[PDB]
């Protein structure tokens, strides 16, 4: 009720042993009343690491997207050693959204590592049951086995009607996903853990389809980008193996579904100025016949007997021997180019004179023609170059023209394909212009480059006039905080870009930009500026392969950065970057990598690896950081995964107030925006959620002063949220959330929620279950409020009540007594947290009334087992409002799975194999349904204290020869766990 505090564990320990005498009654009662629940004491079980590898085949659906709406691939297993380390070998094959699938090694939700199928963005198949949202859905297949060696799993995805179907050895898998959101590009993905060798049959060159694809399903090898060569890589990696060592890698940029939609700049909407004819004729005359200039007597000599139809591709007629209605299309063509120039804001220059004054009619002696004599019809107009502004300008001309053509082709029904199939309306060139290969780009734009340099020769030289996941901060553990001496640590810039590097205090904020506040002293080498509570130019921009020295000396209270063994002087010329630096808590190596950035954080584990150290740092008196440190230095990376954390009392903008004991008003937690209508007002979408869940029953059975018998027979619970006066109901969203809700959307609405309907299959094809899973079961307050209500000055103070019922798993929402049509029916053993996602529009925003209704027990009786039959509303200190914080720290694992990926053969296809088993001990928080690393407690000292006192309670309750209690404790703490904790050095 009050919460996790170690003093109650101290009391429980004092209950057991008294002056060296064991009280058997207390030792048995504490065990029986605490251990079996497994909901209050942190649990530790050893699990396996899970690593996912994708073929980077990103396909999707959008309004006008060039991508095809059906795809199919295969994965077949070569070897599986099941149960290699006394745990299920995590093997899963399926699709996954490119925006939302973040299978970071270690940690994760549930009781284990996450693969494809442990999140509502990825949908996998274990061979026996489907996986989505971290739950197993048993399906009917002829094999009824987990995918074993010499077994092929076919997987197809249809976007037009969203459906992912699986097939085991040519036998259809009954039960498919449906109605999943298409926001983002799906890609094939397998999670293999350890002791698994699989291979991707993508069809065509990349493997062979052992089973024929279903009709209408294109092979996945026909979706590789033209500019990109097919490969296999992890979904997202914060560390990549390299020659010098572990290369820390920042967040990567993935293509969005909006990129594949070719919306061009409209050119026919604008009218032409009265100068239309003048530029049009001069531009048209040459462009009529440049191709003739390039093809007469070099291609196929034209004959007047025919018309460019029997090996006569060029033609030289300035009189336009082809029909004039056909020919004046070229005049209207140059007019259209003028319209496009107007759309891009290009005017009529006349900077130079007429180019015909310096016209050099270039008719080579080799080039000649019978008809119309031999004359150079194209206007060479001597020579003229292209200004770089005009090269980028003609680049966007070609971009706009190709986007117009691509949009028109999409309207016709064309789609992108690696291998061109004209009858199937498939070709490799309708991908958007930035997605076009460079050869296609230049082949598009060469003619317009000639035309635009002709325009410049005429004289028309007219110019055309946070997500918290674009920086990744890697810092040392707070355990290695140095407070004295001189330390040196190198940082190599493998990829040039925004890669801040320096020394940070241990209280470094996760989402705050590195060096923006006073908690860091960093150097931005991309543009050359030192950052600490601001920015100032310093040093010089670096290049690829450059190493920064990053020395601190706290004897002199200064920080020095050196580039390639040369001290970076400041703008004033002083050698030291920062001066007069208090020691404070301490300093830690730190580096924030930007998007698509690679940096080698070379701490001084060995001076042999430390290059340029003797050049700068061995002489000056700087000890290398971690010189004698036997084990590798442990790092912490900004996880960039939204996590629900308690609202800080000292939050500059948000306040939570507890009011209780009122005769009419029940206990309640209200939210107040402290500084509203001020210079610093945050209208960001605040995601608030109560700390404790209301778990649903294991089996969903059919089951004025209030009636006591009904009160004891009640399985429904009431909970209201009152929206304060002046707060818009159009900005509130009242309901429930699952413990795996990770969505910090700044413009969140009801259509952004994760929702996948697993429709079970029967042999005849008719549906069996059709069970829906959703991430948050919420209802918009704008739906309750009547349209047309404006200002909110009526002070309605609408309350939204959530009548949940655990015996049937059914929740229904009400507003001011008016029943709402929004009803939800969920699975058994589901944990729902009360939650409101509100955009603040008033000084007082919302308030959680934890009250009750007629013949309905309050939510305290739902969360708290000790108050199971208590109908009086109450709120102990554990029940607190928590905000969705965007970024939190995460320990980098000491070792990662070594996965060998390579193309086995031209017909075998790409293959992925892992043979090294890695195990970690997981600290599972029961009520939140998330497991951290047991080593991650080295910096979270409150959980460390609680777990240490929990272990001490275990020892006290099994002490003095309690063999029965020791046997009871062996279930919670296994022999493998004990041996792994003994051997673990971190």
């Amino acid at each position: 009720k009050h919460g996790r505090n170690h003093k109650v564990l101290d009391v429980l320990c004092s209950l057991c042993v008294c002056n060296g005498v064991a009280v058997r009654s207390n030792q048995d009662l504490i065990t029986e009343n605490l251990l079996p629940g497994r909901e209050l004491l942190l649990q530790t079980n050893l699990i396996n690491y899970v690593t996912s590898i994708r073929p980077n085949i990103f396909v999707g659906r959008a309004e006008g997207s060039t991508q095809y709406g059906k795809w199919y691939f295969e994965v077949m297993v070569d070897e599986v050693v099941p149960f290699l380390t006394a745990q299920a070998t995590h093997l899963r094959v399926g699709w996954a959204l490119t925006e939302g699938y973040s299978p970071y090694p270690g940690g994760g939700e549930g009781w284990g590592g996450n693969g494809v199928g442990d999140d509502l963005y990825s949908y996998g198949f274990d061979g026996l049951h489907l996986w989505t949202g971290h739950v197993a859905r048993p399906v009917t297949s002829p094999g009824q086995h987990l995918l074993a060696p010499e077994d092929v799993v076919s997987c197809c995805l249809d976007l037009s009607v969203p459906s992912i179907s699986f097939r085991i050895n040519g036998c259809p898998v009954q039960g498919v996903f449906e109605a999943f959101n298409l926001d983002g590009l799906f890609f094939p993905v397998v999670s293999f853990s350890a002791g698994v060798k699989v291979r991707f049959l993508l069809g065509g060159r990349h493997g062979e389809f052992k089973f024929l694809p279903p009709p209408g399903y294109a092979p996945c090898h026909e979706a590789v980008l033209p500019r990109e060569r097919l490969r296999l890589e992890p979904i997202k990696e914060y560390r990549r193996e390299g020659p010098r060592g572990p290369h820390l890698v920042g967040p990567s940029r993935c293509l969005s579904h909006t990129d594949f939609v070719p919306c061009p700049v409209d050119t026919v909407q604008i009218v032409l100025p009265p100068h239309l004819e003048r530029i049009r004729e001069k531009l048209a005359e040459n462009i009529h016949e440049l191709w003739a200039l390039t093809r007469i007597e070099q291609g196929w000599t034209y004959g007047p007997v025919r018309d460019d139809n029997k090996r006569l591709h060029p033609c030289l007629v300035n009189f336009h021997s082809l029909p004039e209605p056909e020919r004046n299309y070229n005049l209207q063509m140059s007019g259209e180019t003028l319209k496009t120039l107007l759309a891009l804001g290009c005017h009529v220059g006349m900077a130079d004179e007429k180019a015909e004054d310096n016209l050099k009619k270039t008719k080579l002696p080799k080039t000649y023609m019978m008809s119309n004599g031999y004359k150079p019809a194209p206007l060479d107009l001597s020579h003229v170059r292209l200004t770089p502004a005009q090269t980028t300008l003609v680049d966007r001309l070609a971009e706009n023209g190709h986007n117009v053509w691509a949009r028109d082709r999409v309207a016709q029904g064309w789609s992108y394909s690696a291998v061109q199939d004209i009858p199937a309306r498939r070709n490799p060139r309708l991908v958007p212009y930035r997605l076009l290969d460079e050869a296609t780009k230049r082949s598009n734009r060469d003619s317009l480059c000639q035309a635009v340099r002709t325009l410049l020769g005429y004289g028309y030289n007219i110019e055309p006039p946070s997500r918290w996941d674009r920086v990744r901060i890697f810092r040392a553990e707070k355990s290695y905080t140095v407070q004295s001496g001189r330390w040196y640590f190198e940082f190599e810039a493998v990829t040039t870009g925004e890669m801040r590097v320096g020394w940070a205090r241990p209280e470094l904020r996760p989402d705050v930009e590195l060096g923006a506040d006073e908690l860091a002293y960093v150097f931005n080498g991309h543009r050359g500026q030192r950052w600490h509570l601001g920015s100032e130019p310093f040093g010089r921009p670096w290049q690829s392969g450059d190493v920064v020295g990053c020395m601190i000396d706290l004897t002199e209270n200064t920080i020095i950065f050196t580039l390639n063994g040369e001290v970076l002087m400041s703008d004033s010329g002083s050698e030291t970057a920062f001066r007069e630096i208090e020691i404070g808590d301490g300093f830690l190596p730190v580096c924030s990598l930007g998007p698509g950035q690679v940096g080698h954080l070379n701490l001084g584990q060995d001076v042999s690896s430390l290059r340029f150290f003797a050049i700068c740092g061995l002489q000056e008196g700087f000890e290398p950081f971690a010189i004698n440190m036997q084990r590798p230095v442990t790092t912490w990376f900004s996880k960039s995964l939204p996590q629900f954390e308690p609202v800080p009392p000292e939050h500059p903008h948000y306040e939570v107030a507890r009011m209780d004991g009122t005769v009419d008003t029940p206990p309640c937690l209200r939210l107040a925006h402290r500084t509203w209508g001020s210079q610093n007002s945050l209208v960001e979408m605040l995601f608030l959620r109560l700390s404790l869940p209301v778990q649903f029953h294991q089996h969903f059975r059919c089951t004025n002063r209030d009636d006591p018998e009904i009160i004891l027979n009640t399985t429904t619970y009431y909970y209201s949220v009152r929206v304060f006066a002046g707060q818009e109901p159009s900005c509130v969203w009242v309901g429930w959330v699952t413990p795996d809700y990770h969505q910090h959307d700044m413009n969140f609405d009801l259509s952004k929620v994760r929702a996948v309907t697993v429709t079970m299959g029967d042999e005849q094809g008719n549906v069996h279950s059709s069970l829906k899973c959703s991430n948050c079961y919420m209802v918009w307050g704008g739906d309750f409020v009547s349209p047309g209500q404006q200002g909110r000055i009526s002070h309605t103070d609408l309350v939204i009540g959530c009548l949940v019922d655990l015996a049937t798993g059914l929740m229904t929402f009400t507003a001011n007594g008016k029943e709402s049509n929004t009803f939800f029916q969920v699975e058994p053993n589901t944990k729902l947290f009360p939650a409101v996602f509100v955009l603040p529009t008033h000084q007082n925003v919302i308030q959680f009334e934890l009250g009750k209704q007629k013949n309905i027990m309050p939510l305290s009786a739902a969360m708290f087992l000790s108050e199971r039959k208590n109908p009086a509303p109450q709120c102990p200190p554990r029940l607190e409002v928590q905000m969705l914080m965007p970024v939190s720290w995460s320990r980098m694992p000491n070792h990662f799975l070594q996965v060998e990926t390579r193309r086995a053969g031209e017909r075998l296809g790409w293959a992925v194999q892992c043979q090294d088993p890695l195990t970690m001990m997981a600290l599972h928080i029961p009520e939140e349904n998330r497991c951290m690393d047991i080593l991650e407690l080295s910096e979270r000292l409150d959980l460390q204290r609680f777990h240490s006192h929990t272990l001490r309670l275990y020892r006290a309750v099994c002490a003095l020869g309690n063999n029965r209690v020791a046997h009871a404790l062996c279930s919670h703490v296994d022999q493998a766990q004990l041996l792994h904790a003994l051997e673990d050095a971190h």
Partner: nanobody
Amino acid sequence: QVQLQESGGGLMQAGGSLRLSCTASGSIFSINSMGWYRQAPGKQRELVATITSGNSINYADSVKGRFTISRDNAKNTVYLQMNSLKPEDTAVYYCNADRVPNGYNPWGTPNDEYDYWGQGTQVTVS
């Protein structure tokens, strides 16, 4: 938007009259130098002569037999007479309308491929 409704396709023996009609329904843009890419079954689309706006007959690879091709200016329907049917003439005739003039292209690949290619009909011919 410019969809070409090619109609006909009745099975006639060699030497039977087959006047077929491709109704080029759509915008006036991308309508000239339009040709019947008759895709032979399993064997690719040979181009029938290419007539531009104004009936400019330009002989192409498949001009084997009779091939009287004439586009109505107002009705915007190409009438292609196939009296001299041949075993080589059996194909799904697929008329495509483009804006590039025949053998006369100041653009490059974007407009070279900028053709409203509509669905034809299977002219099965003995």
